[PDB]
Design an enzyme around this catalytic site. Sequence first.
Site, short mmCIF file in Angstrom:
data_model
loop_
_atom_site.label_atom_id
_atom_site.label_comp_id
_atom_site.label_asym_id
_atom_site.label_seq_id
_atom_site.Cartn_x
_atom_site.Cartn_y
_atom_site.Cartn_z
N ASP A 23 -7.61 5.05 -1.65
CA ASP A 23 -8.88 4.33 -1.71
C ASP A 23 -9.38 4.18 -0.29
OD1 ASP A 23 -11.09 2.77 -2.22
OD2 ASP A 23 -9.96 0.90 -2.46
N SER A 70 -13.66 2.70 -4.41
CA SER A 70 -14.45 3.86 -4.81
C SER A 70 -13.64 4.81 -5.69
CB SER A 70 -14.98 4.62 -3.58
OG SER A 70 -13.93 5.19 -2.81
N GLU A 128 -13.75 10.57 -7.80
CA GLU A 128 -12.78 11.02 -6.81
C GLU A 128 -11.49 11.41 -7.52
OE1 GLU A 128 -12.21 8.05 -3.73
OE2 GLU A 128 -14.38 7.64 -3.74
N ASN A 159 -6.09 13.96 -5.77
CA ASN A 159 -5.96 13.00 -6.87
C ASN A 159 -5.70 13.61 -8.25
OD1 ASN A 159 -6.32 10.45 -5.51
ND2 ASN A 159 -8.50 10.94 -5.31
N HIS A 202 6.72 6.97 1.48
CA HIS A 202 7.48 7.97 0.75
C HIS A 202 8.96 7.58 0.65
CE1 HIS A 202 4.21 11.23 1.67
NE2 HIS A 202 3.85 10.38 0.73
N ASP A 259 12.66 10.20 -1.76
CA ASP A 259 13.80 9.68 -1.01
C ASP A 259 15.10 9.91 -1.78
OD1 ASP A 259 15.67 8.25 0.38
OD2 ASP A 259 14.59 6.33 0.35
C1 HEM Z 1 0.78 11.27 5.89
C2 HEM Z 1 0.15 12.05 4.85
C3 HEM Z 1 0.52 12.04 3.51
C4 HEM Z 1 0.62 13.15 2.74
C5 HEM Z 1 0.29 14.58 3.14
C6 HEM Z 1 1.07 12.72 1.43
C7 HEM Z 1 1.37 13.57 0.36
C8 HEM Z 1 1.87 13.19 -0.88
C9 HEM Z 1 2.15 14.10 -1.97
C10 HEM Z 1 2.02 15.63 -1.96
C11 HEM Z 1 2.61 13.35 -3.00
C12 HEM Z 1 3.07 13.89 -4.34
C13 HEM Z 1 1.93 13.86 -5.34
C14 HEM Z 1 2.32 14.46 -6.67
O1 HEM Z 1 3.38 15.12 -6.75
O2 HEM Z 1 1.56 14.29 -7.65
C15 HEM Z 1 2.61 11.97 -2.55
C16 HEM Z 1 3.07 10.88 -3.28
C17 HEM Z 1 3.17 9.56 -2.83
N1 HEM Z 1 2.68 9.13 -1.61
FE1 HEM Z 1 1.89 10.23 -0.14
N2 HEM Z 1 1.22 11.35 1.39
C18 HEM Z 1 0.85 10.92 2.65
C19 HEM Z 1 0.80 9.57 3.00
C20 HEM Z 1 1.10 8.47 2.22
C21 HEM Z 1 0.83 7.09 2.57
C22 HEM Z 1 0.08 6.64 3.83
C23 HEM Z 1 1.27 6.32 1.53
C24 HEM Z 1 1.22 4.92 1.37
C25 HEM Z 1 1.27 3.94 2.42
C26 HEM Z 1 1.80 7.25 0.55
C27 HEM Z 1 2.46 6.91 -0.61
C28 HEM Z 1 2.91 7.77 -1.61
C29 HEM Z 1 3.65 7.38 -2.77
C30 HEM Z 1 4.19 5.97 -3.01
C31 HEM Z 1 3.80 8.48 -3.55
C32 HEM Z 1 4.43 8.53 -4.93
C33 HEM Z 1 3.35 8.26 -5.97
C34 HEM Z 1 3.86 8.31 -7.39
O3 HEM Z 1 5.07 8.57 -7.59
O4 HEM Z 1 3.05 8.10 -8.31
N3 HEM Z 1 1.62 8.56 0.96
N4 HEM Z 1 2.16 11.89 -1.24
CA LIG Z 2 -12.52 4.26 -1.02
CA LIG Z 3 13.94 4.30 -0.51
O LIG Z 4 0.31 10.12 -0.77
#
Ligand code: HEM
Ligand SMILES: [Ca+2]
Ligand SMILES: [Ca+2]
Ligand SMILES: [O]
Length: 306
Positions: free
Chosen positions: A43, A52, A64, A70, A170, A222
């Site tokens: 967001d 949004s 979005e 998304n 992550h 993780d």
């Molecule tokens: C630094 C760049 C980042 C990239 C390129 C990125 C990329 C991704 C990708 C590829 C996924 C997997 C989506 C899927 O398989 O459907 C993901 C999941 C996730 N990301 Fe990021 N992410 C980034 C930053 C962050 C940040 C800043 C946060 C929160 C502070 C975050 C929190 C999460 C969480 C908690 C998941 C798991 C969501 C779920 O299991 O529903 N990510 N991210």
């Molecule tokens: Ca927004």
């Molecule tokens: Ca952990």
């Molecule tokens: O993410």
Amino acid sequence: QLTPTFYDNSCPNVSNIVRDTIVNELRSDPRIAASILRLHFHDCFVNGCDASILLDNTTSFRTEKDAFGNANSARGFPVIDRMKAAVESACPRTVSCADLLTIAAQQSVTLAGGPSWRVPLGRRDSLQAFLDLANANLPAPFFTLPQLKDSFRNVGLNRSSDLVALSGGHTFGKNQCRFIMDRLYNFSNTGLPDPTLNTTYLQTLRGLCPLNGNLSALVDFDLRTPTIFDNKYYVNLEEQKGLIQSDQELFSSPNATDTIPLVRSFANSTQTFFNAFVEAMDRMGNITPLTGTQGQIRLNCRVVNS
Ligand code: HEM
Ligand SMILES: [Ca+2]
Ligand SMILES: [Ca+2]
Ligand SMILES: [O]
């Protein structure tokens, strides 16, 4: 100026209602806390934290939810609707969807074992959604470190600590096999796996994500503590066990001179990480908010008031 006490008089039970909603949902969906934290991130990176991303399609603007970052990925929208309805019942036309999602993100982190803090409040809801902006602003797992830094700076987060700390999101959650297939079998058209991926972990991931297998299959971000919000994410990086390219680059990129010390500091101390995470989260939550009389207090987070 956003303030943590914004609803202390108008809706003192808001955080409690949000928490209760997440606690109940976690029983049937242990992934919801991670999903909700991510919704807040997506967001804030698009026109700021203005809810949004929660808007559905209209004939004048696209949602979005269909952005590359998304679609078939972002989730938990009905849960946000549930807490919004509950909050509207407790305090009619008071808490914005933007603030609601911010509180939900913080509560999600705390419920998963992370730090506890009162987020600044006073944000208001957007009058439109930004699909093109989401496609342009949301980072991708295949981004190089310079590209990741560019993406964060583009939305207002200049500090490497912002990038390294927020990437700690992550420490829990899921990731689709599709996003790591290149690292596993053909990285950067070399026909070889990503050399920064620990070879033993490589074998494990190849077993979970075989070539020509189900690209939608989910893997844990993780490998140490899949659902607990802690600093293990960084210990993994030090061992070349970051799941996606963007995770591992924080420690292995040729441009990581500034991020390596941060990764180490967060891996060495939970307190150091938690403090940095709260600081970075609040900075992200302060990205171009609509305040005062700007925007509105959306009643249904999916549609603009009429
Ligand atoms: C630094 C760049 C980042 C990239 C390129 C990125 C990329 C991704 C990708 C590829 C996924 C997997 C989506 C899927 O398989 O459907 C993901 C999941 C996730 N990301 Fe990021 N992410 C980034 C930053 C962050 C940040 C800043 C946060 C929160 C502070 C975050 C929190 C999460 C969480 C908690 C998941 C798991 C969501 C779920 O299991 O529903 N990510 N991210
Ligand atoms: Ca927004
Ligand atoms: Ca952990
Ligand atoms: O993410």
